Amino acid sequence: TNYATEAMDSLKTQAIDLISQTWPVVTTVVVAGLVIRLFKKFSSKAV
Amino acid sequence: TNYATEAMDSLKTQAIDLISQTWPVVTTVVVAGLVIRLFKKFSSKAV
Amino acid sequence: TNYATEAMDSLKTQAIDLISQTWPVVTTVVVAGLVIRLFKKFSSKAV
Amino acid sequence: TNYATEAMDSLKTQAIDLISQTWPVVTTVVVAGLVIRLFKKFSSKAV
Amino acid sequence: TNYATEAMDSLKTQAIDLISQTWPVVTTVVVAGLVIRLFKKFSSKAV
Amino acid sequence: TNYATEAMDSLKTQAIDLISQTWPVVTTVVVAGLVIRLFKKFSSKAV
Amino acid sequence: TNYATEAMDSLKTQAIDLISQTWPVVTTVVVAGLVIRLFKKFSSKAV
Amino acid sequence: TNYATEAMDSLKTQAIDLISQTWPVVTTVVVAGLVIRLFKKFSSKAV
Amino acid sequence: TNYATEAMDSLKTQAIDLISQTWPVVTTVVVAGLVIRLFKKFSSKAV
Amino acid sequence: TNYATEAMDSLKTQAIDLISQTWPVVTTVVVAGLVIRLFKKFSSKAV
Amino acid sequence: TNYATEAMDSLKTQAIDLISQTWPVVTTVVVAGLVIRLFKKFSSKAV
Amino acid sequence: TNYATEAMDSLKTQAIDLISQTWPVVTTVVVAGLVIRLFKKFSSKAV
Amino acid sequence: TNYATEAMDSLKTQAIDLISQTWPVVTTVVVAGLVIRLFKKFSSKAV
Amino acid sequence: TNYATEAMDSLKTQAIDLISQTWPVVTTVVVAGLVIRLFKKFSSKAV
Amino acid sequence: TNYATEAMDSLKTQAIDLISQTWPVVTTVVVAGLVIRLFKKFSSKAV
Amino acid sequence: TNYATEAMDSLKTQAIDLISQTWPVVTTVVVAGLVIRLFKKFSSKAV
Amino acid sequence: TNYATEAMDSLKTQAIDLISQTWPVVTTVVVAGLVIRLFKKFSSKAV
Amino acid sequence: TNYATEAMDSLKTQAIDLISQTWPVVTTVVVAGLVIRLFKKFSSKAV
Amino acid sequence: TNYATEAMDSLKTQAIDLISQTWPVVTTVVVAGLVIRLFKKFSSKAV
Amino acid sequence: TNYATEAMDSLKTQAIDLISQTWPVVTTVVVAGLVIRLFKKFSSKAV
Amino acid sequence: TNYATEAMDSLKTQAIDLISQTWPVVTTVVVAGLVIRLFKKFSSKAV
Amino acid sequence: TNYATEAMDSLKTQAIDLISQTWPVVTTVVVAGLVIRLFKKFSSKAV
Amino acid sequence: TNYATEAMDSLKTQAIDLISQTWPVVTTVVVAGLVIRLFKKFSSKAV
Amino acid sequence: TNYATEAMDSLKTQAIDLISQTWPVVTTVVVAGLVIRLFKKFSSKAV
Amino acid sequence: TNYATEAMDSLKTQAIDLISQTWPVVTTVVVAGLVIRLFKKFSSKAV
Amino acid sequence: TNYATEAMDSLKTQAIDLISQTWPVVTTVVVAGLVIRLFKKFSSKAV
Amino acid sequence: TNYATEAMDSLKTQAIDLISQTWPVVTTVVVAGLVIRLFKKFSSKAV
Amino acid sequence: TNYATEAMDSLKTQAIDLISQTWPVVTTVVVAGLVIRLFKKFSSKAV
Amino acid sequence: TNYATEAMDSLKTQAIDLISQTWPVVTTVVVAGLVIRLFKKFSSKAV
Amino acid sequence: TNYATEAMDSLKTQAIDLISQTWPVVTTVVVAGLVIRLFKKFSSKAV
Secondary structure, three states: OOOHHHHHHHHHHHHHHHHHHHHHHHHHHHHHHHHHHHHHHHHHHHO | OOOHHHHHHHHHHHHHHHHHHHHHHHHHHHHHHHHHHHHHHHHHHHO | OOOHHHHHHHHHHHHHHHHHHHHHHHHHHHHHHHHHHHHHHHHHHHO | OOOHHHHHHHHHHHHHHHHHHHHHHHHHHHHHHHHHHHHHHHHHHHO | OOOHHHHHHHHHHHHHHHHHHHHHHHHHHHHHHHHHHHHHHHHHHHO | OOOHHHHHHHHHHHHHHHHHHHHHHHHHHHHHHHHHHHHHHHHHHHO | OOOHHHHHHHHHHHHHHHHHHHHHHHHHHHHHHHHHHHHHHHHHHHO | OOOHHHHHHHHHHHHHHHHHHHHHHHHHHHHHHHHHHHHHHHHHHHO | OOOHHHHHHHHHHHHHHHHHHHHHHHHHHHHHHHHHHHHHHHHHHHO | OOOHHHHHHHHHHHHHHHHHHHHHHHHHHHHHHHHHHHHHHHHHHHO | OOOHHHHHHHHHHHHHHHHHHHHHHHHHHHHHHHHHHHHHHHHHHHO | OOOHHHHHHHHHHHHHHHHHHHHHHHHHHHHHHHHHHHHHHHHHHHO | OOOHHHHHHHHHHHHHHHHHHHHHHHHHHHHHHHHHHHHHHHHHHHO | OOOHHHHHHHHHHHHHHHHHHHHHHHHHHHHHHHHHHHHHHHHHHHO | OOOHHHHHHHHHHHHHHHHHHHHHHHHHHHHHHHHHHHHHHHHHHHO | OOOHHHHHHHHHHHHHHHHHHHHHHHHHHHHHHHHHHHHHHHHHHHO | OOOHHHHHHHHHHHHHHHHHHHHHHHHHHHHHHHHHHHHHHHHHHHO | OOOHHHHHHHHHHHHHHHHHHHHHHHHHHHHHHHHHHHHHHHHHHHO | OOOHHHHHHHHHHHHHHHHHHHHHHHHHHHHHHHHHHHHHHHHHHHO | OOOHHHHHHHHHHHHHHHHHHHHHHHHHHHHHHHHHHHHHHHHHHHO | OOOHHHHHHHHHHHHHHHHHHHHHHHHHHHHHHHHHHHHHHHHHHHO | OOOHHHHHHHHHHHHHHHHHHHHHHHHHHHHHHHHHHHHHHHHHHHO | OOOHHHHHHHHHHHHHHHHHHHHHHHHHHHHHHHHHHHHHHHHHHHO | OOOHHHHHHHHHHHHHHHHHHHHHHHHHHHHHHHHHHHHHHHHHHHO | OOOHHHHHHHHHHHHHHHHHHHHHHHHHHHHHHHHHHHHHHHHHHHO | OOOHHHHHHHHHHHHHHHHHHHHHHHHHHHHHHHHHHHHHHHHHHHO | OOOHHHHHHHHHHHHHHHHHHHHHHHHHHHHHHHHHHHHHHHHHHHO | OOOHHHHHHHHHHHHHHHHHHHHHHHHHHHHHHHHHHHHHHHHHHHO | OOOHHHHHHHHHHHHHHHHHHHHHHHHHHHHHHHHHHHHHHHHHHHO | OOOHHHHHHHHHHHHHHHHHHHHHHHHHHHHHHHHHHHHHHHHHHHO
16 A cells, blocks of 8 residues: 555564664674684694 | 435545554554564574 | 415425435434544554 | 216316325425435445 | 336435445445555564 | 225235335345445455 | 524534534543553563 | 404414414424434444 | 413423433433443453 | 345345455465465475 | 533543543553563573 | 455455565565574584 | 544554653563573583 | 114125225235335344 | 234245245355355464 | 254365365475475484 | 123134234244354354 | 243254254364374474 | 213223223233243343 | 233243243353363363 | 312322332343343353 | 303312322323333343 | 422432442442453463 | 332342352363363473 | 353363363373373483 | 442452462462473583 | 264374374384484494 | 452462472483483493 | 365465475585585594 | 553563562572583593
């Protein structure tokens, strides 16, 4: 409609901004959970 | 009639304006009830 | 007669004007009794 | 008689013209009292 | 009669025009009350 | 009598033609008042 | 008439004032019956 | 006559004044019997 | 007349006092029949 | 009757055509509401 | 009227007091139905 | 009817456009909820 | 109407304030339910 | 008398034949006014 | 009587044929309104 | 009845054929959703 | 009298036979109007 | 009465046969809707 | 007189016996017209 | 009277027997409409 | 008079005894028509 | 006259006492016919 | 009047006592129909 | 009245005994529907 | 009542037998769904 | 009212006591469902 | 009942056959997933 | 209530006995699943 | 039906194409998640 | 509102106190589940 398609476009613009907002948290959790593993791995390799 | 068809046209112009008045409430309830769900979903995905 | 048919024509012109006078009350009661129902219906649809 | 049967024929021609004069009032009262009911019925059906 | 059958034909032509006048209100109430439901349904499906 | 039984037969032939004249209005009001209900019922079933 | 049309105008001015008097009760019942539903809905969304 | 037509004119002037005297009672009974019905109708609509 | 118009004025003053006497019963029946309905409605809303 | 049974046959032919008209909407709502669920299910299976 | 508008004001003052009386029950049911859910949620988070 | 089948065709053309409007939101939520999972999976595979 | 559109605007201003009131509870439940999970995750990473 | 009792017997034989002539009109009015009501009743039962 | 009992037997034979005429419409509305529900139920069971 | 029990037998023969029609979809969704899981399981076992 | 009491006894024997003639129509209308309702009720219970 | 109690016994014998006719549909819908669930449950248990 | 008072006593003894003769017809019409209504009422209550 | 109070006692003894005749139909409809619901409820609980 | 006022007192003592005779039928119809409704209501509440 | 005006005054004093004698019967019939209706109304409201 | 206003005051004092008599039944039906619902709700919350 | 208040007290004593009769069914359905759920819950906890 | 309490006792004896009939299905589904899990657990422990 | 607000206060005092009665069941189910999990967790930690 | 207990016995005989049908899949998945592990274990022991 | 609080106490005494019945199964599964692990651990330590 | 079986065939042809569309993603995720593991395994074997 | 925002503030003050109550359990489970791991790690380092 005039309304329903406008509503879905509003919802999609909510969702895309929400996803682009979630990705920094995903990187700073996953990458920091892997550096803390690489450190253990190469520290054990170092000795 | 002169009256009855005029009455139905008055009623239809009442109803269409009422529906176009109700759709903003429907969008701002449904979309805000879905963003509050997408936030939970992608927040759980973020960890 | 000269009188009786004139009397019936007077009566018919009374009655038609009376009916055309009653129809605005009928519209403003019935339509206002239906908008007050459409409002309940679409308000319940809105939530 | 020459008079009494002529009187009854005069009376019958009065009465038939009176009845044919009354029927338009009957239609414009009854039909307008039923359209004002059909309008209520189908207006309630419309919502 | 000459009158009564003419009266019923007048009444039927009133009623059929009244029904064909009521159907647009029925469509614009029912269909707009169902699109407002499909929107909720597929919006919940969208998340 | 010669007259009274003829009068009742005239009245019965008035009445039967009047009833057979009323039945089309009854069908086109009742059936159109039920299709307008079946439409609501199966439209709600459709969603 | 001088009287009957004046009577219908009196009746219409009674009815319109009565309808405009009824609408505040309709709003304060329906809207308060919907806020009490939105509260349940978004409270369940909040957890 | 000099008397009989004067008598009928006296009678007509009695009757017209009597009718114009009766119409206020008719309005204040009928309109007050309809406001007491509109109140019930729109009060039931209000809830 | 001296009498008939006085009689109609007596009748009107009877009728108006009777109507103003009936309205308290109408309010205390209708309003108490609606509070007993609002209580059911909002009690069901309360749970 | 000649009329009533004809009326019921008219009503039945209205209703059957209405049902056969409603079934495409039912399929295109239900099947599209299930493909949108199978997609989620097998997409989660895909990872 | 003097009566009908007074009746609607009485009804509105009934209804508003009834709604303000219902809201404590709504809070003490909904909030106690959500604390009993938060307890389950954070108790499962605690282990 | 002339109206009811036209109403169902209007409803179906509403619904199909609504579904084709909902599918982009479904893809951009589901696919973005799976890439955010593949990233975690292959990031853990990467170390 | 003068009333119905005013009623919907009142309802919308109720609803938007209610949603903006619910979002702090949603953040302080969801974020506190995720920090309590990140703590477990990175505490297990810490050893 | 020879005459008066013969007159009453003539009158009674007039009246009984008149009543037996009236009963078909009574059946074809009443029964046709009830079938037209049963049709409405069971048609509403049919939907 | 000779007439009244014959009239009631005519009325009963009208009514029984009318009921046996209404039952096909009842089956083809109710059963088609239940298959359209079983389809939704078992389609949701199918996924 | 002659009709109602026949209607229920028609409904049961609709339903049983519908269930026997739904079971192939259930098998080809569930079994294909489990082979796609066994493949992952034994592929991880294979390395 | 010899006549009047005999007339009332004739009238009572007319009336009792008429009532015992009306009761089969009452049963076959009411019971068939209730089986057509029980069928709808238990058919909806069946699904 | 002779009639009314016989009518209620007829109605009860209609109803009991209708219920005993509905129970096979209830079993073949409910049990087939549960086997289709047990299959999913134990199929997921099987892997 | 010797005659007139005797005549009135004869008339009163006619009238009292006539009234006591009419009351059985009144009971068997009214009570049978109410049982036929109670049956409809409680039959509708029974379903 | 001798008659009227006897008539009311006859009517009351009709009515009480009618009510005690209706209660078995009420139990065998309501209880059988609830066992058919308990079966669905506990069958869903069983899986 | 000596007679007319005595007649009205006789009539009033007839009427009051008749009303006090009618009230048991009113209670045993209305209360038994409400217990048969409370049973349905709380039986549906019981499941 | 000396007599005729005295006769009319006697008649008026008969009539006024008769009317004041009739009003208690009118109240105890009408009010008892309305309490028996209010009881039904509010008893149905009570459930 | 002396009588009519006294009659309305009698009627109002009947009605107010009747309403104050009905309210205990309304509370003990509605509140007991809601505690039986709160018990189900919080019992399901308890597990 | 002597009757109406006695009728309401009879009705209240019917209703309270009916409610106290319904509560055992409510407990033995709800508690047995929750033990059958606790068993599933703690059986899954047991493994 | 004599009937309503007997009806509730019938309903309770239906329900208790139904629950005692459902518990074997619950045990043979839950226990067989847990042995199939213990087998996996201790089979993995066995290697 | 005197009654309705008293009814809501009765209902609230029912509900609060019911909630304070439900919380011990919630604690003894949830805490015992978590100790049975902590035991598994720390028993696996113990080896 | 005659039906409900027969329905539960049908359901139990469905379920037991379904479980005895699922166990071969469970053995041929679990045992083949353990032989593929014993082979790795004893192959590593072999060197 | 007298019933609802008694029902919750019955439910709590069901649940506590059920939990105290489940704990032996939990110990004899978990402890036997850990001794079978300690045996592997210290057997590998033994060589 | 003509529709329902056609709907299930449409749904099955949706589902099979969806599954055959999902399998390439499953292979390119699982196989690429195993080559990335074989590389680690045989690279550690290579030194 | 005056109530709804107060309700959300009550809910938030419930939730924050609940979270601050849960954190000690989280620390004393997680930290004690990590010291029991550090002990194993450094005990194996000690030999």
